[PDB]
Design a protein around this ligand. Structure first.
Ligand SMILES: Cn1ccnc1C(=O)C(F)(F)F
Length: 113
């Protein structure tokens, strides 16, 4: 399927134990997609002071369309030193590994895969 229905656990930035997916744009997009497949991916909502607490390169989910079965259609955009790899809509948040942190909420997304 070109799209997969996912429910992403929303984590508080100060709870996150593994603050990024790796060390290159290509690695973080690869790792994010693997973790999204494996159900081991969390979402942090972007506000003032969040991104400096996480590790670059960043992987964003961004709204790709204006929402089947309650799931917002999204795609992945990476960012490193202020350059984005991909072009998409509004940020829903930044992806991180999930290693058992307790979420505050779930975000239903339809991921372009
Ligand atoms: C290949 N695949 C199967 C299920 N999900 C995938 C992805 O690449 C995804 F985009 F979801 F990360």
């Amino acid at each position: 399927k070109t799209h997969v229905q996912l429910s992403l656990p929303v984590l508080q930035v100060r709870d996150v134990l593994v603050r990024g997916f790796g060390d290159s744009v290509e690695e973080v997009l690869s790792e994010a997609r693997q973790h999204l497949k494996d159900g081991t991916c969390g979402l942090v909502e972007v506000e003032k002071g969040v991104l400096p607490q996480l590790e670059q390169p960043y992987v964003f989910i961004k709204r790709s369309d204006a929402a089947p079965h309650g799931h917002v259609m999204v795609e992945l955009v990476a960012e490193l030193e202020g350059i984005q790899y991909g072009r998409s809509g509004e940020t829903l948040g930044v992806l991180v590994p999930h290693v058992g942190e307790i979420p505050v909420a779930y975000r239903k997304v339809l991921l372009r895969k």
